[PDB]
Design a protein around this ligand. Sequence first.
Ligand code: ZN
Ligand code: ZN
Lengths: 92, 95
Amino acid sequence: RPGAIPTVQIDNERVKVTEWRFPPGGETGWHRHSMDYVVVPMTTGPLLLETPEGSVTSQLTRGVSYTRPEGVEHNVINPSDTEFVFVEIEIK
Amino acid sequence: MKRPGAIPTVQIDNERVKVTEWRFPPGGETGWHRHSMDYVVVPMTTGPLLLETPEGSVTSQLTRGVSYTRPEGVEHNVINPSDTEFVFVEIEIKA
Ligand SMILES: [Zn+2]
Ligand SMILES: [Zn+2]
């Protein structure tokens, strides 16, 4: 797949904030989250998450934030024909 | 005369963070406040904000999705000088 593009916006003693910009069909690659994190979606739409429990399609809504814990392990894919963006705030 | 209030909606409030969506009517403001925590601002709207601090007033240009951080201790009033609603998500980091 094409690669999603992470841009780190903030990396201080308290948080690391990364913008993830997905081209259509783009993926993060598999990773494991080492920190609790908050997601602020900048786009409304579905994401495809490959997870240890299998494939999960999730609905994100622009401007509706949510949090997930340290230990989440997955590959995130943009299953749409448009760009998808979200901001991820990892708590240190 | 009084500017309309910006409206806070708490999205997350847990051991680690408090995340509040702030929605500004046209011309709207926060009122003066003091930030008790380091915080992250994720703008949801591209546009100017007018920031009133003890020393003066400045126009700051925000871009949707371009975050920034400010430290504990900020004292200000924040105003939306535009003719349309301005929205940002504020992530306060608990100690
Ligand atoms: Zn992830
Ligand atoms: Zn403030």
